[PDB]
């Protein structure tokens, strides 16, 4: 059907090839997955050798990684902002590999607070009134507190990250082919990558 | 071709089988196994053509379905099972044991061995490997995977394995000054002492071999088998002892034995 072959298109010299055989199967080709954002929907494609290949047609969750301290959590994709290849893949917000998405910052914040015993986001004059957040931020023995005061030293977050946390949504880049593995796994944008992409989103936006 | 091929025509059959033309159209396409299609000896060929125990492929079928023939200490009820190099074929009811090692010419000789020698075989290691728990792995020339080997054995050595346990006893390192039988190319069956190895990064490394009588010949490294340390082979050899004398010498020896018979 959808042919994936070299013999259908002109030689290096601009001379036409006359096809010496009809379409073979291994010269295969199938329609594009076109993965949207919605409730989990995955169809299975049986491929050469009797192996499987999962078509994610809708996805909500995704395994994203805060790379600077090896904090990976399953979060909830909310929307797409910028795609490098094509900008109709933004309009009809398709999930493809290496597209910029926004994710829920809540599992990263929860880990950050429970690891450093310091607040992240939570704007000045934050009423922490359930006060089991204050349990996670206070009430230790002696030597355990020494370990936690030792560690809070190197919890200096990049201001670019700290804004996104306080807004409540982080930028991430999809590192897995979602149309072939049925997964929207990626990494949270940081440093020079983040400054590059934040310029690109603002510039395009206007 | 829309899939794997199952018929092998008699003219396409490997030449070392010495199959006659006017018998049929086909030869026995060897069933998949440890050795390659091209370089094996199918059990029907060895049993019917070489030994002359059977006359037809149906007679060979009638033998091999009584569990008589044992290849490498396991019963093989497949008449086109590929029996290749170094393989040990023990028939119990007759009380006879054969090791398939090459004639001095490019074919398999029918070399009888003793009950005590038909208990092991030499395997050329093909690739060393680490498994899924830092467990080291060997792969041999006859498709055997041996795990937890000796930590010195490397990619071109020879190992002596036992045909009950399938475990490594002793091994011969691939060095200069070690006996090697040549198991591929023009020099097929030539025994000699390794003189040199010539390294070519990206290409096939050629290895110089010295025969007993000062005959020097090269072969690609792949087609060499270290069968002994020094001049001492760890197996028994056919009559000739892998020299491959010239055609003028073979004539002289033939008509010497002829005229002596008279």
């Amino acid at each position: 059907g959808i042919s994936r072959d070299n013999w259908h298109k002109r030689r290096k010299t601009g001379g036409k090839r006359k096809p010496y055989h009809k379409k073979r199967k291994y010269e295969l080709g199938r329609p594009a997955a076109n993965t949207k954002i919605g409730p989990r929907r995955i169809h299975t494609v049986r491929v050469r050798g009797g192996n499987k290949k999962y078509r994610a047609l809708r996805l909500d969750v995704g395994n994203f990684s805060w790379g600077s301290e090896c904090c990976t959590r399953k979060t909830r994709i909310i929307d797409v902002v910028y795609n490098a290849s094509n900008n109709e893949l933004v309009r009809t917000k398709t999930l493809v590999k290496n597209c910029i998405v926004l994710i829920d910052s809540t599992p990263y914040r929860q880990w950050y607070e429970s690891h450093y015993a310091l607040p992240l986001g939570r704007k000045k004059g934050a009423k922490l009134t359930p006060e089991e957040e204050e349990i996670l931020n206070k009430k230790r023995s002696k030597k355990i507190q020494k370990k936690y005061d030792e560690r809070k030293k190197n919890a200096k977050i990049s201001s670019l990250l700290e804004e996104q946390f306080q807004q409540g949504k982080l930028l991430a880049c999809i590192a897995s082919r979602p149309g072939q593995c049925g997964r929207a796994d990626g990494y949270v944008l940081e440093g020079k990558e983040l400054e590059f992409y934040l310029r690109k989103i603002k510039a395009r936006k206007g | 071709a829309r899939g794997p091929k199952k018929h092998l025509k008699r003219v396409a059959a490997p030449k070392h089988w010495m199959l006659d033309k006017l018998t049929g159209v086909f030869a026995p396409r060897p069933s998949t196994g440890p050795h390659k299609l091209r370089e094996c000896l199918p059990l029907i060929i060895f049993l019917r053509n070489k030994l002359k125990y059977a006359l037809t492929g149906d007679e060979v079928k009638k033998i091999c379905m009584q569990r008589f023939i044992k290849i490498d200490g396991k019963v093989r009820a497949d008449i086109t099972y590929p029996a290749g190099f170094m393989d040990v074929i023990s028939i119990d009811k007759t009380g006879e044991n054969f090791r398939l090692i090459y004639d001095t010419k490019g074919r398999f000789a029918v070399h009888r061995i003793t009950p005590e020698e038909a208990k092991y075989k030499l395997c050329k290691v093909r690739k060393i490997f680490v498994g899924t728990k830092g467990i080291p792995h060997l792969v041999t020339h006859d498709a055997r995977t041996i795990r937890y080997p000796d930590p010195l054995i490397k990619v071109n050595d020879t190992i002596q394995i036992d045909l009950e346990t399938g475990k490594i006893t002793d091994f011969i390192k691939f060095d200069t000054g070690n006996l090697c039988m040549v198991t591929g190319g023009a020099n097929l069956g030539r025994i000699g002492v390794i003189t040199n190895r010539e390294r070519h990064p990206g290409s096939f490394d050629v290895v110089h071999v010295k025969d007993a009588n000062g005959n020097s010949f090269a072969t690609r490294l792949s087609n060499i088998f270290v069968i002994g340390k020094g001049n001492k082979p760890w197996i028994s050899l056919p009559r000739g002892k892998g020299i491959r004398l010239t055609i003028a010498e073979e004539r002289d020896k033939r008509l010497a034995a002829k005229q002596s018979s008279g």
Partner: protein, 37 residues
Amino acid sequence: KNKEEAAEYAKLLAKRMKEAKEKRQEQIAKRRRLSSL
């Protein structure tokens, strides 16, 4: 079988590593030989 193969390898390997370590101290013996023969 898994247990006995692991135990027999541990013996043979540890012996081969003792051989290499006897060589390791000859490596340092070659260092000090180049230092003061």
